[PDB]
């Protein structure tokens, strides 16, 4: 079918430009109508532009005309959106979307999105601390342990446990914005309490804006 | 704001039928351009729900249907289920200047009558690694509560404390309950100089309090 992968989140300065990529697999790019739709945090969907197969032309939305460029590399099945003269109102998740060009549909498939943050503040990778299991985090046959992902910027951070081999009973919480203007979040996993002496637990933290990954071993409190 | 207009919110009880309208103009829906609908579940990307006014993509249940008449379109959900809590967006095309894709402003759907659920609260003390870095953070994690309103208070020993507390707004989980977290920032000397700290979570008149103490290695 169609699968889409996008470039990673990043912070850009006001007045700068951003270039977001979208790599397509399953269908060749020539068979697809590519579009870009953004969503500012807590707001609705805004179409930026995309391919009109009836005229065979890429058309931009009025509000971005003169600031946006959409291009493609069909040798690599990759589409690109570049947005210039960035401002606060451009902080948003940018989705590539596509529909088969044989249809008029623009968004049968949505990419995973790329969060672009427009700010004068610089990128900061996280400091990761273990949240060790103890008698005060146990619930009989299960126990809670976690990771504290401190003082990063911009969003997002993702967390997995044991490389994704633990999924049931993972909960990664939304981040807090601290007085410093930096974010923190936590992730917890519930595991068997009998296990804790012998099993290895690792939180896998990904901060794409800083090109940082941290695998933090979480050991029982001693 | 939006070129297409939707209600901000709709609600119904499980098993009932609810409708979401989408009104446009003679340059979009009234020009006979198709209307598609997208569902955005809490924490996810939008996904196609209805296409070409009334058709279901593979995988969408037959409880979802759509229609169009004149300048308006409507999404109907029968047999409403708690998993249908989501934001719903209509989409069409508008020829006022050139080709364009236009969206509705979205509708938040609430499923009424969901049972109250008390919070699960876990409180972690500062890690040894963080203390050795001359910092200290208490972490209060609050999950699986319903409805979404929760109050969080902290105590140092028995006395209320506000300095250093930073708390997130409740956020809808994928299971329709809510999560929040609260962080108390202290110096290592403050952490070591009290007998205990507590996080108190109040939800629908009842309170869950967890405590940690620097003299525990538990």
mmCIF file of N, CA and C in Angstrom, chain B residues 31-80:
data_model
loop_
_atom_site.group_PDB
_atom_site.id
_atom_site.type_symbol
_atom_site.label_atom_id
_atom_site.label_comp_id
_atom_site.label_asym_id
_atom_site.label_seq_id
_atom_site.Cartn_x
_atom_site.Cartn_y
_atom_site.Cartn_z
ATOM 1 N N UNK B 31 -21.083 23.576 -5.010
ATOM 2 C CA UNK B 31 -20.600 23.434 -6.370
ATOM 3 C C UNK B 31 -20.517 21.963 -6.781
ATOM 4 N N UNK B 32 -20.994 21.082 -5.923
ATOM 5 C CA UNK B 32 -21.044 19.633 -6.086
ATOM 6 C C UNK B 32 -19.684 18.934 -5.942
ATOM 7 N N UNK B 33 -18.673 19.595 -5.367
ATOM 8 C CA UNK B 33 -17.423 18.942 -4.999
ATOM 9 C C UNK B 33 -17.635 17.976 -3.839
ATOM 10 N N UNK B 34 -16.897 16.878 -3.880
ATOM 11 C CA UNK B 34 -16.981 15.836 -2.862
ATOM 12 C C UNK B 34 -16.599 16.352 -1.491
ATOM 13 N N UNK B 35 -17.128 15.685 -0.470
ATOM 14 C CA UNK B 35 -16.805 15.898 0.908
ATOM 15 C C UNK B 35 -16.230 14.621 1.469
ATOM 16 N N UNK B 36 -15.077 14.733 2.130
ATOM 17 C CA UNK B 36 -14.470 13.602 2.826
ATOM 18 C C UNK B 36 -14.407 13.970 4.306
ATOM 19 N N UNK B 37 -14.261 12.988 5.163
ATOM 20 C CA UNK B 37 -14.204 13.181 6.592
ATOM 21 C C UNK B 37 -13.004 12.439 7.138
ATOM 22 N N UNK B 38 -12.398 13.046 8.148
ATOM 23 C CA UNK B 38 -11.204 12.513 8.842
ATOM 24 C C UNK B 38 -11.499 12.422 10.334
ATOM 25 N N UNK B 39 -10.971 11.381 10.977
ATOM 26 C CA UNK B 39 -11.055 11.150 12.401
ATOM 27 C C UNK B 39 -9.668 11.304 12.993
ATOM 28 N N UNK B 40 -9.589 12.092 14.052
ATOM 29 C CA UNK B 40 -8.358 12.252 14.799
ATOM 30 C C UNK B 40 -8.572 11.836 16.240
ATOM 31 N N UNK B 41 -8.109 10.635 16.557
ATOM 32 C CA UNK B 41 -8.186 10.108 17.896
ATOM 33 C C UNK B 41 -7.147 10.790 18.765
ATOM 34 N N UNK B 42 -7.418 10.848 20.093
ATOM 35 C CA UNK B 42 -6.490 11.491 21.026
ATOM 36 C C UNK B 42 -5.060 11.009 20.820
ATOM 37 N N UNK B 43 -4.185 11.942 20.507
ATOM 38 C CA UNK B 43 -2.786 11.647 20.397
ATOM 39 C C UNK B 43 -2.294 11.107 19.077
ATOM 40 N N UNK B 44 -3.129 11.078 18.045
ATOM 41 C CA UNK B 44 -2.822 10.457 16.765
ATOM 42 C C UNK B 44 -2.902 11.505 15.653
ATOM 43 N N UNK B 45 -2.394 11.128 14.463
ATOM 44 C CA UNK B 45 -2.608 11.826 13.195
ATOM 45 C C UNK B 45 -4.049 11.644 12.706
ATOM 46 N N UNK B 46 -4.574 12.568 11.922
ATOM 47 C CA UNK B 46 -5.847 12.317 11.263
ATOM 48 C C UNK B 46 -5.748 11.097 10.372
ATOM 49 N N UNK B 47 -6.898 10.445 10.171
ATOM 50 C CA UNK B 47 -7.029 9.350 9.216
ATOM 51 C C UNK B 47 -8.389 9.430 8.507
ATOM 52 N N UNK B 48 -8.365 9.034 7.248
ATOM 53 C CA UNK B 48 -9.571 9.036 6.425
ATOM 54 C C UNK B 48 -10.659 8.142 7.032
ATOM 55 N N UNK B 49 -11.853 8.714 7.116
ATOM 56 C CA UNK B 49 -12.999 8.031 7.730
ATOM 57 C C UNK B 49 -14.123 7.759 6.747
ATOM 58 N N UNK B 50 -14.488 8.780 5.926
ATOM 59 C CA UNK B 50 -15.504 8.689 4.885
ATOM 60 C C UNK B 50 -14.896 9.363 3.674
ATOM 61 N N UNK B 51 -15.115 8.796 2.495
ATOM 62 C CA UNK B 51 -14.660 9.466 1.285
ATOM 63 C C UNK B 51 -15.823 9.589 0.295
ATOM 64 N N UNK B 52 -15.738 10.616 -0.551
ATOM 65 C CA UNK B 52 -16.693 10.908 -1.614
ATOM 66 C C UNK B 52 -18.116 10.848 -1.086
ATOM 67 N N UNK B 53 -18.312 11.624 -0.022
ATOM 68 C CA UNK B 53 -19.552 11.964 0.660
ATOM 69 C C UNK B 53 -20.107 10.846 1.531
ATOM 70 N N UNK B 54 -20.019 9.595 1.070
ATOM 71 C CA UNK B 54 -20.783 8.548 1.744
ATOM 72 C C UNK B 54 -20.087 7.213 1.839
ATOM 73 N N UNK B 55 -18.865 7.082 1.385
ATOM 74 C CA UNK B 55 -18.217 5.784 1.303
ATOM 75 C C UNK B 55 -17.246 5.489 2.431
ATOM 76 N N UNK B 56 -17.232 4.265 2.894
ATOM 77 C CA UNK B 56 -16.292 3.861 3.925
ATOM 78 C C UNK B 56 -15.032 3.238 3.327
ATOM 79 N N UNK B 57 -13.854 3.726 3.716
ATOM 80 C CA UNK B 57 -12.622 2.995 3.407
ATOM 81 C C UNK B 57 -12.600 1.677 4.127
ATOM 82 N N UNK B 58 -11.758 0.789 3.614
ATOM 83 C CA UNK B 58 -11.681 -0.513 4.241
ATOM 84 C C UNK B 58 -11.147 -0.308 5.632
ATOM 85 N N UNK B 59 -11.821 -0.945 6.532
ATOM 86 C CA UNK B 59 -11.525 -0.962 7.928
ATOM 87 C C UNK B 59 -12.495 -0.106 8.750
ATOM 88 N N UNK B 60 -13.147 0.872 8.160
ATOM 89 C CA UNK B 60 -14.042 1.737 8.928
ATOM 90 C C UNK B 60 -15.360 1.011 9.222
ATOM 91 N N UNK B 61 -15.841 0.985 10.443
ATOM 92 C CA UNK B 61 -17.099 0.278 10.703
ATOM 93 C C UNK B 61 -18.330 0.888 10.027
ATOM 94 N N UNK B 62 -19.377 0.017 9.762
ATOM 95 C CA UNK B 62 -20.578 0.567 9.142
ATOM 96 C C UNK B 62 -21.409 1.434 10.051
ATOM 97 N N UNK B 63 -21.026 1.632 11.330
ATOM 98 C CA UNK B 63 -21.685 2.626 12.139
ATOM 99 C C UNK B 63 -21.461 4.046 11.634
ATOM 100 N N UNK B 64 -20.408 4.277 10.816
ATOM 101 C CA UNK B 64 -20.115 5.584 10.284
ATOM 102 C C UNK B 64 -20.707 5.691 8.883
ATOM 103 N N UNK B 65 -21.471 6.745 8.648
ATOM 104 C CA UNK B 65 -22.012 7.023 7.330
ATOM 105 C C UNK B 65 -21.943 8.510 7.041
ATOM 106 N N UNK B 66 -22.098 8.858 5.789
ATOM 107 C CA UNK B 66 -22.106 10.263 5.442
ATOM 108 C C UNK B 66 -23.129 10.583 4.379
ATOM 109 N N UNK B 67 -23.511 11.848 4.357
ATOM 110 C CA UNK B 67 -24.430 12.326 3.329
ATOM 111 C C UNK B 67 -24.120 13.785 2.997
ATOM 112 N N UNK B 68 -24.708 14.264 1.865
ATOM 113 C CA UNK B 68 -24.554 15.638 1.398
ATOM 114 C C UNK B 68 -25.867 16.058 0.758
ATOM 115 N N UNK B 69 -26.238 17.301 0.978
ATOM 116 C CA UNK B 69 -27.415 17.866 0.312
ATOM 117 C C UNK B 69 -27.200 19.364 0.217
ATOM 118 N N UNK B 70 -27.237 19.943 -0.992
ATOM 119 C CA UNK B 70 -27.171 21.400 -1.080
ATOM 120 C C UNK B 70 -25.775 21.850 -0.734
ATOM 121 N N UNK B 71 -25.692 22.785 0.205
ATOM 122 C CA UNK B 71 -24.396 23.274 0.657
ATOM 123 C C UNK B 71 -23.945 22.625 1.948
ATOM 124 N N UNK B 72 -24.610 21.569 2.384
ATOM 125 C CA UNK B 72 -24.230 20.953 3.650
ATOM 126 C C UNK B 72 -23.888 19.466 3.504
ATOM 127 N N UNK B 73 -23.049 18.981 4.417
ATOM 128 C CA UNK B 73 -22.774 17.578 4.523
ATOM 129 C C UNK B 73 -22.934 17.180 5.996
ATOM 130 N N UNK B 74 -23.121 15.887 6.228
ATOM 131 C CA UNK B 74 -23.295 15.395 7.578
ATOM 132 C C UNK B 74 -22.622 14.048 7.752
ATOM 133 N N UNK B 75 -22.008 13.864 8.898
ATOM 134 C CA UNK B 75 -21.463 12.581 9.333
ATOM 135 C C UNK B 75 -22.411 12.025 10.384
ATOM 136 N N UNK B 76 -22.838 10.792 10.215
ATOM 137 C CA UNK B 76 -23.658 10.122 11.225
ATOM 138 C C UNK B 76 -22.904 8.946 11.820
ATOM 139 N N UNK B 77 -23.005 8.790 13.144
ATOM 140 C CA UNK B 77 -22.495 7.643 13.842
ATOM 141 C C UNK B 77 -23.621 6.972 14.579
ATOM 142 N N UNK B 78 -23.919 5.748 14.212
ATOM 143 C CA UNK B 78 -24.886 5.012 15.023
ATOM 144 C C UNK B 78 -24.196 4.185 16.079
ATOM 145 N N UNK B 79 -24.995 3.704 16.991
ATOM 146 C CA UNK B 79 -24.457 2.749 17.893
ATOM 147 C C UNK B 79 -23.176 3.269 18.495
ATOM 148 N N UNK B 80 -23.264 4.508 18.955
ATOM 149 C CA UNK B 80 -22.086 5.227 19.454
ATOM 150 C C UNK B 80 -21.373 4.436 20.539
#
